[PDB]
Write a protein that holds these residues in place. Structure first.
Motif, PDB file in Angstrom:
ATOM      1  N   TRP A 182       3.353   1.601  14.885  1.00 45.29           N
ATOM      2  CA  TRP A 182       1.911   1.620  15.094  1.00 45.29           C
ATOM      3  C   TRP A 182       1.149   1.332  13.802  1.00 45.29           C
ATOM      4  N   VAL A 183       1.497   2.013  12.703  1.00 46.51           N
ATOM      5  CA  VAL A 183       0.746   1.797  11.461  1.00 46.51           C
ATOM      6  C   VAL A 183       0.816   0.330  11.080  1.00 46.51           C
ATOM      7  N   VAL A 184       2.025  -0.233  11.130  1.00 42.71           N
ATOM      8  CA  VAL A 184       2.245  -1.605  10.685  1.00 42.71           C
ATOM      9  C   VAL A 184       1.462  -2.579  11.551  1.00 42.71           C
ATOM     10  N   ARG A 185       1.561  -2.422  12.870  1.00 42.09           N
ATOM     11  CA  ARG A 185       0.927  -3.384  13.767  1.00 42.09           C
ATOM     12  C   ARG A 185      -0.584  -3.199  13.801  1.00 42.09           C
ATOM     13  N   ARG A 186      -1.057  -1.955  13.970  1.00 43.08           N
ATOM     14  CA  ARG A 186      -2.502  -1.716  14.035  1.00 43.08           C
ATOM     15  C   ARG A 186      -3.224  -2.200  12.787  1.00 43.08           C
ATOM     16  N   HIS A 187      -2.657  -1.948  11.611  1.00 45.89           N
ATOM     17  CA  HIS A 187      -3.372  -2.172  10.363  1.00 45.89           C
ATOM     18  C   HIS A 187      -2.858  -3.396   9.624  1.00 45.89           C
ATOM     19  N   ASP A 188      -2.084  -4.229  10.312  1.00 44.75           N
ATOM     20  CA  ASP A 188      -1.614  -5.522   9.809  1.00 44.75           C
ATOM     21  C   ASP A 188      -0.979  -5.367   8.422  1.00 44.75           C
ATOM     22  N   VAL A 189      -0.014  -4.448   8.313  1.00 45.88           N
ATOM     23  CA  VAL A 189       0.619  -4.206   7.026  1.00 45.88           C
ATOM     24  C   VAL A 189       1.560  -5.354   6.707  1.00 45.88           C
ATOM     25  N   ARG A 190       1.413  -5.909   5.516  1.00 49.33           N
ATOM     26  CA  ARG A 190       2.140  -7.088   5.072  1.00 49.33           C
ATOM     27  C   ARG A 190       2.833  -6.825   3.747  1.00 49.33           C
ATOM     28  N   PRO A 191       3.833  -7.637   3.380  1.00 50.09           N
ATOM     29  CA  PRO A 191       4.587  -7.341   2.149  1.00 50.09           C
ATOM     30  C   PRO A 191       3.753  -7.272   0.891  1.00 50.09           C
ATOM     31  N   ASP A 192       2.653  -8.028   0.790  1.00 49.78           N
ATOM     32  CA  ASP A 192       1.874  -7.967  -0.435  1.00 49.78           C
ATOM     33  C   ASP A 192       0.922  -6.787  -0.470  1.00 49.78           C
ATOM     34  N   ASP A 193       0.958  -5.911   0.538  1.00 47.45           N
ATOM     35  CA  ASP A 193      -0.007  -4.823   0.587  1.00 47.45           C
ATOM     36  C   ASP A 193       0.403  -3.677  -0.331  1.00 47.45           C
ATOM     37  N   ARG A 194      -0.568  -2.805  -0.606  1.00 51.84           N
ATOM     38  CA  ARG A 194      -0.404  -1.664  -1.500  1.00 51.84           C
ATOM     39  C   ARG A 194      -0.995  -0.479  -0.770  1.00 51.84           C
ATOM     40  N   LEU A 195      -0.132   0.389  -0.248  1.00 49.88           N
ATOM     41  CA  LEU A 195      -0.571   1.512   0.565  1.00 49.88           C
ATOM     42  C   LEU A 195      -0.687   2.739  -0.330  1.00 49.88           C
ATOM     43  N   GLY A 196      -1.912   3.229  -0.505  1.00 43.98           N
ATOM     44  CA  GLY A 196      -2.112   4.444  -1.268  1.00 43.98           C
ATOM     45  C   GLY A 196      -1.623   5.645  -0.486  1.00 43.98           C
ATOM     46  N   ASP A 247      -4.877   6.695   3.211  1.00 45.29           N
ATOM     47  CA  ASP A 247      -5.090   7.892   4.027  1.00 45.29           C
ATOM     48  C   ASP A 247      -6.149   8.781   3.396  1.00 45.29           C
ATOM     49  N   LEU A 248      -7.055   9.324   4.220  1.00 47.66           N
ATOM     50  CA  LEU A 248      -8.020  10.310   3.740  1.00 47.66           C
ATOM     51  C   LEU A 248      -8.273  11.395   4.776  1.00 47.66           C
ATOM     52  N   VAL A 249      -8.364  12.634   4.302  1.00 50.62           N
ATOM     53  CA  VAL A 249      -8.906  13.705   5.133  1.00 50.62           C
ATOM     54  C   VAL A 249     -10.425  13.631   5.100  1.00 50.62           C
ATOM     55  N   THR A 250     -11.054  14.024   6.213  1.00 52.81           N
ATOM     56  CA  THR A 250     -12.497  13.840   6.373  1.00 52.81           C
ATOM     57  C   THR A 250     -13.283  14.378   5.180  1.00 52.81           C
ATOM     58  N   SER A 251     -12.967  15.598   4.740  1.00 57.79           N
ATOM     59  CA  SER A 251     -13.745  16.237   3.675  1.00 57.79           C
ATOM     60  C   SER A 251     -13.568  15.512   2.343  1.00 57.79           C
ATOM     61  N   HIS A 252     -12.367  14.978   2.093  1.00 63.24           N
ATOM     62  CA  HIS A 252     -12.135  14.169   0.898  1.00 63.24           C
ATOM     63  C   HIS A 252     -12.976  12.908   0.927  1.00 63.24           C
ATOM     64  N   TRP A 253     -13.030  12.253   2.089  1.00 64.11           N
ATOM     65  CA  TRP A 253     -13.817  11.045   2.227  1.00 64.11           C
ATOM     66  C   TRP A 253     -15.301  11.332   2.045  1.00 64.11           C
ATOM     67  N   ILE A 273      -8.954   2.382   5.944  1.00 63.90           N
ATOM     68  CA  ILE A 273      -8.891   3.804   5.660  1.00 63.90           C
ATOM     69  C   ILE A 273      -8.574   4.487   6.975  1.00 63.90           C
ATOM     70  N   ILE A 274      -7.431   5.161   7.031  1.00 59.26           N
ATOM     71  CA  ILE A 274      -7.038   5.948   8.194  1.00 59.26           C
ATOM     72  C   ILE A 274      -7.484   7.376   7.911  1.00 59.26           C
ATOM     73  N   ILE A 275      -8.499   7.833   8.636  1.00 66.56           N
ATOM     74  CA  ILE A 275      -9.262   9.009   8.239  1.00 66.56           C
ATOM     75  C   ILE A 275      -9.391   9.977   9.408  1.00 66.56           C
ATOM     76  N   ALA A 296     -13.022  -3.015   4.228  1.00 70.95           N
ATOM     77  CA  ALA A 296     -12.321  -1.831   4.728  1.00 70.95           C
ATOM     78  C   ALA A 296     -12.955  -1.296   6.000  1.00 70.95           C
ATOM     79  N   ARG A 297     -12.121  -1.076   7.015  1.00 70.82           N
ATOM     80  CA  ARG A 297     -12.543  -0.453   8.259  1.00 70.82           C
ATOM     81  C   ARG A 297     -12.034   0.983   8.300  1.00 70.82           C
ATOM     82  N   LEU A 298     -12.814   1.855   8.920  1.00 70.19           N
ATOM     83  CA  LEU A 298     -12.437   3.248   9.077  1.00 70.19           C
ATOM     84  C   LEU A 298     -11.785   3.407  10.439  1.00 70.19           C
TER      85      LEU A 298
END
Length: 484
Positions: A182-196, A247-253, A273-275, A296-298
């Motif tokens: 799901w993460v990969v497909r929904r958020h179009d994760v590609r080899p050049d990406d950098r996931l915090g 990734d962010l928790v609501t209060s952090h964001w 941002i998956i929040i 960036a989309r939330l």
């Protein structure tokens, strides 16, 4: 008889549409995909932590050494192995090596109070071998001969909302693989990406960032502790590190939103941002998109640890400026139901308790009583008997655009969230009262956690006694001595 027995055809049909979520993802299984990435892309950067960057080749070599060490010490497949959750490279070799050994990891913060770590090790059935030696310095070796068994346990992660009752969520492979796809497909994760990775390895959004990175050849980038509690620096760090997913928790964001209002930010590389974690409103997300120049989309998410990190998602519209953001539609192969006190399915628009079914469910907890209190079986529709996780969360099914969506409506108990972590306020009360010199005390949330207390313990010595007693995130931000 069935949970939906009283509903009208229109009402029943809304739930059947809402939960029409099945999706088949192509194999092979998760660890096989991780190995394939390492085979095809050995030179790509796999993890970037505080002490350096490892290629896929190096990460998997270090993990092989961990797996061989574990086998040499009699840790057979199906064991649970603690790993020290830090922001360095070593825990990544540790946790991947535990998985390569056919075992499950339990992340432990080595700064947590010793008594709480002791409980986690006992309850998880975990060896502390990798807490007591540097996993990244183990002797080089090939990976041991470990045959694939379906749905192996992958991690045990601890959650609270119940003082003196930590519970260890037992998560197995099919759930983690489904989440990764799901993460990969929904958020179009590609080899050049950098996931915090903002969450520490003790908190399960880290799973959502780590495995999609390694299953695609992208780089996992741990967010350093020095950057997180400094929202302005975190915004600049996201730019400097060219982070694509976060990734962010609501209060952090919300802190990041406030920092962005103080200094509007350009984040051209950030795509997602998956929040989630607490309710928030379109008047906040509208503000955000006013001061952040970014594609960036939330993606707003809801879900318990007991159902593999997230259970529902809603793509947050930048247009809207008022109202509550819904928690949205189920993840692939997830099904969710709002039930009343009697276990009947609520009509659309009526608030009930969320029960979750499907591919994301935990095996259970390490504890049998906790498992029996929360996991159960119910015929929700004629011919559909579900294994369900009872969440303690309230929601109603509402129309949003031309679609059904869940809208979160609170808890059943008085569990609150401190920096995204489930906690009962009575636990911090109990800890400060157990300090010598403190008689009475009241703890409040002003995000900021505050404490007033009676007694002749200076707040700096009380803090020192609380750090040894409570995890750092439960130590009140300020400690106010009051006469009464």
């Amino acid at each position: 008889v069935t949970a939906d027995a009283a509903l009208e055809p229109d009402e029943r049909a809304a739930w059947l549409a809402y939960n029409d979520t099945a999706e088949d993802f192509p194999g092979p299984h998760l660890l096989a995909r991780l190995d394939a990435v390492a085979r095809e892309h050995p030179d790509r950067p796999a993890v970037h932590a505080v002490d350096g960057v490892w290629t896929y080749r190096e990460l998997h070599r270090r993990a092989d050494a961990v797996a061989a060490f574990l086998a040499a010490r009699g840790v057979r497949p199906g064991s649970v192995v603690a790993i020290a959750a830090t922001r360095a490279l070593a825990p990544y070799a540790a946790l991947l090596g535990v998985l390569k050994a056919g075992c499950a990891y339990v992340p432990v913060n080595p700064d947590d109070p010793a008594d709480r770590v002791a409980f986690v090790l006992a309850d998880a059935g975990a060896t502390p071998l990798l807490l007591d030696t540097d996993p990244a310095s183990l002797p080089a070796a090939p990976a041991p001969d470990v045959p694939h068994e379906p749905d192996r346990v992958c991690y045990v992660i601890y959650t609270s909302g119940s003082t003196g009752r930590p519970k260890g969520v037992v998560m197995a492979e099919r759930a983690v693989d489904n989440l990764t796809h799901w993460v990969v497909r929904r958020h179009d994760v590609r080899p050049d990406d950098r996931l915090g990775q903002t969450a520490p390895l003790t908190f399960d959004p880290s799973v959502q960032q780590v495995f999609p990175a390694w299953a695609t050849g992208a780089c996992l980038v741990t967010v350093p502790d020095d950057v997180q509690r400094d929202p302005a620096a975190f915004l600049d760090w996201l730019r400097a590190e060219r982070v694509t997913h976060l990734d962010l928790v609501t209060s952090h964001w919300v802190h990041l939103l406030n920092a962005a209002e103080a200094r509007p930010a350009e984040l051209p590389d950030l795509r997602w941002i998956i929040i989630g974690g607490e309710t928030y409103y379109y008047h906040q997300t509208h503000r955000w998109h006013r001061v952040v120049s970014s594609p960036a989309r939330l993606n707003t998410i809801y879900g318990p640890t007991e159902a593999a990190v997230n259970a529902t998602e809603h793509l947050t519209e930048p247009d809207l400026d008022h109202g509550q953001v819904p928690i949205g539609v189920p993840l692939p192969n997830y099904r969710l139901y709002a039930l009343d006190d009697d276990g009947r399915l609520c009509p659309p628009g009526i608030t009930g308790e969320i029960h979750i079914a499907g591919a994301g469910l935990a095996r259970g907890y390490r504890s049998a009583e906790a498992t029996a209190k929360a996991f159960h079986e119910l015929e929700v529709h004629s011919g559909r008997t579900e294994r369900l996780y009872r969440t303690g969360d309230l929601a109603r099914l509402v129309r949003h655009a031309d679609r059904w969506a869940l809208e979160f409506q609170g808890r059943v108990d008085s569990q609150v969230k401190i920096s995204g972590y489930r906690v009962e306020l009575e636990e911090v009360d109990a800890a400060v009262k157990a300090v010598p010199g403190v008689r009475d005390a009241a703890v409040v949330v002003r995000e900021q956690l505050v404490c007033c207390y009676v007694g002749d313990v200076p707040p700096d010595r009380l803090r020192s006694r609380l750090t040894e007693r409570l995890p750092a995130y439960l130590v009140p931000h300020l400690l106010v001595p009051v006469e009464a």
